[PDB]
Each structure stands twice: as C-alpha cells, then as structure tokens.
Amino acid sequence: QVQLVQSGAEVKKPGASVKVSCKASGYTFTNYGISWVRQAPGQGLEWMGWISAYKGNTNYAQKLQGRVTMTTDTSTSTAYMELRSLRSDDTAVYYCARPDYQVLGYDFWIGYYGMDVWGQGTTVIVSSASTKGPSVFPLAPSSKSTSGGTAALGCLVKDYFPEPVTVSWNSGALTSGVHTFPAVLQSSGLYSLSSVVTVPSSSLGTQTYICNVNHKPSNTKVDKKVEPKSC
Amino acid sequence: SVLTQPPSVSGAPGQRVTISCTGSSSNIGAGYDVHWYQQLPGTAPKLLIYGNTNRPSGVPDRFSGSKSGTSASLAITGLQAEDEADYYCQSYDSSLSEVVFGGGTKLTVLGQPKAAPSVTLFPPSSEELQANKATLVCLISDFYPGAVTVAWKADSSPVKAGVETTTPSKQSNNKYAASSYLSLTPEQWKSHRSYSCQVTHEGSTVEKTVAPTECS
C-alpha cells in the first residue's frame, strides 16, 4: 500500500511563509526522492523541485530559487516544502510525488524519471483578505431581455472570503432551471459567484423568487427577493 | 509551459485519438525521455506513460506512447467515457536543468452533438451602483464541449483589465456553463455608449451588448 499523505489546506497573507508536509508509507522512504509540483486554478502543472531522502540533495526550479526550501525527516518518513515571501500568484494546489527511481548513489538523476505515486494535494490560498461576508445584488430581468416564455433571473454574490457559499432558491422550493456557478478568486483576493434561475414568464408578476445565500465562515445568511426591473 | 500540447482534442467512444507534444533542442530534441500524466477533474495526476513508451502496471493497455526526434505522442485507442480528463506530457530541459511540462490537453469524449452557448449579459444593478461599484455579469450556458474564450469590449475598444472568468462546469444535461465578470467604476459604466462580452466557442463568437442609456 504505497501512498503519500499531505498536510491540510492553508490560507496565508502575502509576505508570509507556508510549510507543507508529505508523509510516505508502504515503501523504503530513503531509497527514493520526493518531487514537488504545483497547479494554479485553471492552469497546468508546474515543477518546483525535488529532494533525495537518503542524501538530502535538492534541485529547485530557477523561478523559486532563494524562496523555496525542501527537507526530509527520515525518522518519520516525511518530506517538507517551505515557500517563503508568499505572493498572490502562489495560490495553487501543491503536490508531492515520488519519481520512480531508486537512487544508487548519484541523486541528481531523480528528476529524470516519471512520478508514479502522488499525494492528494494541498490547497494554498494567498490573499491579503480576512473573513468577509458577501454582498448580494439582484440580476433582474427586463421587458427587453425577456422575449419569450422563459426569463432569466439570479443573484450576484460579491466579494466574500473564504469559501464556501451555498445558494438555494425559495428555501429549496425551486430547483428546476437553477444553476449556481463556481466561485472565481479575484485579483483583490476575494471570491464572487452567481446563481440563476430560468423561469416561466407568466409567474413573474405573482410568484416570488428569493436567493438564499449562506456564508458560514462569516456567520452570514442573506435572503434577496429578485423582482423584475421597471424597464 | 516549455512543451507545446494541443489545447483540446475530442473523439467519439471507441475511436482512437492522439495527443502531440513538441519541444525544442534543449528537451525532447536533446533526446530526453517523455512521460505522460492523466488528471481527472479535481484529483491528483496519474502516471500513464513513462520512458516514452512504457506502461506502468495497472494502466490499461488502451494507452500507448511514442517519441520522435522533435515530438512525443500519447495514443488512446478505444475511447471510454472515463478517459475524459486533462493530459500532460513531461520531459527534462538542459539549460544554463529542470523538469518541464506541457500546457495540458483537455480530452472530450463526445457524448452529444456540439452546442453553441446561450449568453445572458446583465448590466450593473441599481443597488450595486449605490455602493459605488459596477459589475457586468456575462452568464454562459448550454455549450458542449466545455471550452470557451471570453473577451470584453468597451464601446468598440477591447477591455484588458477587470475581467474574471470561471472554468466551465457541468450542468445536469452534461452540457457546460461558465460565467465572466467585468468590474467597473460607476463613472466608467455611465461614460461609455455600450459594453459587450464576446464568448468564442469552437471558433464561433457570440456577442451580447448592454448600454447605460438603454435600461435592460
């Protein structure tokens, strides 16, 4: 049962440091190295460096030199990765992985082989923000945006931190035609999302539509009745 | 990324698809091995091919790899639905000495015909303008495959700041939905004649427009 288990998610402000651990089991830890790869939201994979467990040698990506440090504790079969002077573009899921190469004496051939065992990943969010409740604004339909028997209405859940936010409509009495979009992390370090309903035109004047936004991290619940625009 | 992969490939179930991976004289052109990884949405990558052509024990024989002097290729024969994932090639680069990846390729196993996105653009609400903020909301639904490009325009000019777009996410009907936001100043919103979000899907562009002088 070979596997690598990483530490829990982290939220840091710019300038701080983060240290992620990677516990190994099921194999002789000292016969292999540990590689680190990160992945920004919606982006590809990005190599950070590797460390050999036996000799402690390292090789870091040039873009992180002087900013990253990798260590190993052979007595606990754990590798560590420390990234300093954190900036907002360090927001990513960080993975540890084992290159499938048994070091025979020369450790620097470790990075030449495929990584066959991967950790589960560690989310690291870098943001200057603290806990902040969302602002909810209506996305109301008008007589011009409503040509046929179906109209679109929703709520904009703006500038909250951190995740998650749950949105329901009419306390769960309305689920058909509802879509809640994934949140986007903005350059401000805050999240925003939207949720919409496609609804029959005949019910607009007499049926109430209410977005129920719950943000447990800030102890906030907001109910916003979305009515059509006057135009 | 240092290695170049196609942004997306697609195929019907049972068909055979290939994902190419080109580099330069300092990586693949230098004779370095190429490895391939599969990443399901939300999970860690999984090694598919190592040493150009070798399959690890447990990986289905549907996957295979090859390498020339300039490029590498991952071949997937007999497409299954479970193969819908992102695929990365990985190699080594010798410079004045790092691991390098390709940009990733999104493989779509086509389970339905192509669908152009439905686009609903929302002007800033009156309530938001009272908060000295202004956000245009471009909502994109019912497109397949799940890949769109979103551009914004102010009057006839391109918008290059204040744009945030979400990665597409599946609806119930196996189609995909996405959203884009243009954060603006109330003065910026009211001083221009119109704003537009342009969504490109499979080379075709859908453009919706709103204007402060025409309530909608």
CATH of the domain at B99: 2.60.40.10
Residue A118, φ and ψ in degrees, nearest 5: -125, 145
A 196-215 residues inside an 8 A Cβ radius of B: 196
Give the right CATH number for A135-226 from 2.40.160.100, 2.40.37.10, 2.60.40.3080, 2.60.40.10: 2.60.40.10
Residue pair B17/B79 in contact by the 8 Å Cβ criterion: yes
Domain final residue, candidates B87, B109, B131: B109
| Residue B127 DSSP one-character state | H
Query: Which tokens sit at A219?
Result: 């102890």
Neighbour count for residue A105 (Cβ, 10 Å): 7
Question: Cα separation of A114 and A151, whole Å?
Answer: 52
User: Which secondary structure element, helix H or strand E, spans residue B161, and what is its range?
Assistant: none
Residue A201, SS3? Answer: helix
**Residue B1: inside a domain:** no
Residue B175, SS3? Answer: coil
Query: Which tokens sit at A230?
Result: 């006057």
Resolution for the entry shown, Å: 2.0
CB contact under 8 A, B33 and A95: no
Superfamily of domain A3-126 in CATH is: Immunoglobulins (2.60.40.10)
Closest CA to A199 of A229, A224, A179: A179
Question: Cα separation of B122 and B105, whole Å?
Answer: 32
Say whether both B77 and B152 belong to one domain.
no
Residue B130, SS3? Answer: helix
Say whether both B92 and B141 belong to one domain.
no
Q: Strand A220-225 to strand A178-180: parallel, antiparallel, or no bridges (unpaired)?
A: unpaired
CA distance A53 to chain B (A): 19
Q: Which residues of B touch A142 (CB under 8 A)?
A: 215-216
**Residue B3: inside a domain:** no
Question: Cα separation of A37 and A93, whole Å?
Answer: 9
CB contact under 8 A, A113 and B125: no
Query: Which residues are within 8 A (CB) of A93 and not within 5 positions of it... i.e. 6 or more apart?
Result: A38, A39, A121, A122, A123, A124
Residue spans per domain, chain A: 3-126, 135-226
Of the residues B100, B136, B179, the best mutation for testing chain A's interface (the one with the most A CB atoms within 10 Å of its CB) is: B179
The alpha-carbon radius of gyration of chain B (Å, integer) is: 22
**Residue B45: inside a domain:** yes
Query: Which tokens sit at B103?
Result: 């940009």
A 81-110 residues inside an 8 A Cβ radius of B: 95, 97, 100
Number of domains within chain B: 2
CA distance A189 to chain B (A): 12
Q: Please, where are the H alpha helices in B121-191?
A: 126-130, 186-191
Say whether both B17 and B63 belong to one domain.
yes
Using the Cα atoms of residue A155, residue A156, residue A158 and residue A160 in order, give the sign of their dihedral: positive
Closest CA to A165 of A129, A217, A130, A210: A217
CB contact under 8 A, A135 and B131: yes
> What is the separation of C-alpha A12 from the centre of its chain, rounded to a whole number of angstroms?
13
Say whether both B21 and B98 belong to one domain.
yes
Q: Which residues of B touch A45 (CB under 8 A)?
A: 37, 39, 45, 88, 90, 101, 104
CB contact under 8 A, B215 and A137: no
Q: For chain B, first and last CA: distance in Å? A: 42
Query: Which residues are within 8 A (CB) of B127 and not within 5 positions of it... i.e. 6 or more apart?
Result: A137, A138
Which residue matches tokens 């805050």? A190
Q: For A172, how many CA atoms within 13 A lie in the half-sphere containing its CB?
A: 2
Say whether both B97 and B143 belong to one domain.
no
Residue pair B90/B36 in contact by the 8 Å Cβ criterion: yes
Question: Cα separation of B64 and B49, whole Å?
Answer: 7
CA distances (Å), origin B188, targets B52, B137, B159, B185: 54, 15, 12, 5
CB contact under 8 A, B135 and A156: yes
Say whether both B12 and B72 belong to one domain.
yes
Query: Which tokens sit at B77?
Result: 């024969």
Torsion of CA B153, B157, B160, B162, to 10 degrees: -50
CA distance B204 to chain A (A): 22
Question: Cα separation of A59 and A42, whole Å?
Answer: 26
∠ CA B143-A157-A148, nearest 5°, is: 45
SS3 content of chain A, % helix, strand, coil (to 5): 10, 50, 40
Q: Which residues of A touch B183 (CB under 8 A)?
A: 186
Say whether both B123 and B43 belong to one domain.
no
Question: Cα separation of A71 and A54, whole Å?
Answer: 11
| Residue A226 DSSP one-character state | -
Residue pair B5/B20 in contact by the 8 Å Cβ criterion: yes
- Smallest CA–CA distance from B124 into chain A, residue: A139
> B78: domain range?
8-109
Query: Which tokens sit at B209?
Result: 């427009």
Residue pair B87/B37 in contact by the 8 Å Cβ criterion: yes
DSSP symbols for A140-183: ---TTT--SSEEEEEEEEEEEBSS--EEEEGGGT--TTEEEPPP
Strand partners, A10: A124
Strand ranges in chain B using DSSP code E only, listed in sequence order? 8-11, 17-22, 35-39, 46-49, 63-67, 71-76, 86-93, 98-101, 105-109, 118-122, 134-143, 149-154, 157-159, 163-165, 169-170, 176-184, 195-201, 204-210
Domain final residue, candidates B74, B109, B144: B109
- What method did the depositors use to determine the structure? X-ray
**Residue B216: inside a domain:** no
Say whether both B103 and B148 belong to one domain.
no
**Residue B65: inside a domain:** yes
Strand partners, A109: none
Residue pair B149/B193 in contact by the 8 Å Cβ criterion: no
CB contact under 8 A, B125 and A137: yes
Say whether both B47 and B68 belong to one domain.
yes
A 112-151 residues inside an 8 A Cβ radius of B: 112-116, 118-121, 135, 137-140, 142, 144-145
